[PDB]
């Protein structure tokens, strides 16, 4: 409620920092941290094993969050902002040119 | 509301010890009456209750961090069933 932003479980372009350029999908939006997931900013997390179960632990791990701002959606063209159309009975987010 | 009186079985060395005789102990509504419990138990587990003992169980005071509190107070009811009768559900 209001806590809303620009992306959802779709395809985006990173404009950020370490991954400026990188492109990825479903960022499992938070937005308590106002971040997304994508496929970059993935750090190595140490592991002892939260309980012997699943013994050994490595260093290649998971993908970290990314401030929602560092990313830009894309469809039938490239980066670019998002607009909103009424669909004659709806409200779908459309891009200035393409449409989603 | 008959199933609102009996909250759950107690489960503990001492409690089980009762099972030999028709002695089943339960966690019941803090306000529940001995008579209220007798009925509750009869219709719930289909048995004949002949004795009912109850005792209050003050909640243990606990502390997680600088935050101090207590656990909810409770009532324990140990109902005795008519000769040779078992509350199936509590056996095993």
């Amino acid at each position: 409620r209001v806590k809303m932003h620009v992306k959802k479980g779709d395809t985006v372009l990173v404009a950020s920092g370490k991954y400026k350029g990188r492109v990825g999908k479903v960022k499992e939006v938070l937005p308590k941290k106002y971040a997304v997931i994508v496929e970059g900013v993935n750090i190595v997390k140490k592991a002892v094993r939260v309980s012997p179960k699943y013994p050994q632990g490595g260093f290649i791990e998971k993908e970290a969050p990314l401030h929602a701002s560092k990313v830009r959606p894309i469809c039938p063209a490239c980066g670019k902002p998002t607009r909103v159309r009424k669909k004659f009975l709806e409200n779908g987010k459309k891009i200035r040119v393409c449409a989603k | 509301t008959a199933y609102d009186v009996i909250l759950a079985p107690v489960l503990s060395e001492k409690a089980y010890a009762g099972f030999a005789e028709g002695k089943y102990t339960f966690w019941v509504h803090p306000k529940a009456t001995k008579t209220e419990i007798k009925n509750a138990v009869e219709t719930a587990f289909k048995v004949k209750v002949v004795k009912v003992n109850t005792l209050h169980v003050r909640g243990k005071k606990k502390r997680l961090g600088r935050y101090l509190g207590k656990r909810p107070d409770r009532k324990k009811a140990i109902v005795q069933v008519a000769p040779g009768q078992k509350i199936e559900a509590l056996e095993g």
């Binding site: - | 008959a2 199933y3 009996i6 759950a8 079985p9 489960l11 719930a44």
Partner: protein
């Protein structure tokens, strides 16, 4: 659950007082049945408990509206 939820209000709304009270009695026992298992471990699908706790809330909520005129 949302779907299987928009039913009761209907499949339960059309019955009357004597039909519900008994239905609710049934549910209340089922709830006992549950909370009775957890205490021992068995049951763990929590979702079930809270799910049943709220069902009763509905039946009662519906029965409370019926007992205000009707026939």
């Amino acid at each position: 659950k949302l779907s299987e939820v928009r039913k009761q209000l209907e499949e339960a709304r059309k019955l009357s007082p004597v039909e519900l009270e008994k239905l609710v009695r049934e549910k209340k026992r089922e709830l006992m049945e549950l909370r009775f298992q957890a205490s021992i471990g068995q049951l763990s699908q929590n979702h079930k408990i809270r799910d049943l706790k709220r069902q009763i809330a509905r039946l009662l909520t519906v029965l409370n509206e019926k007992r205000r005129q009707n026939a």
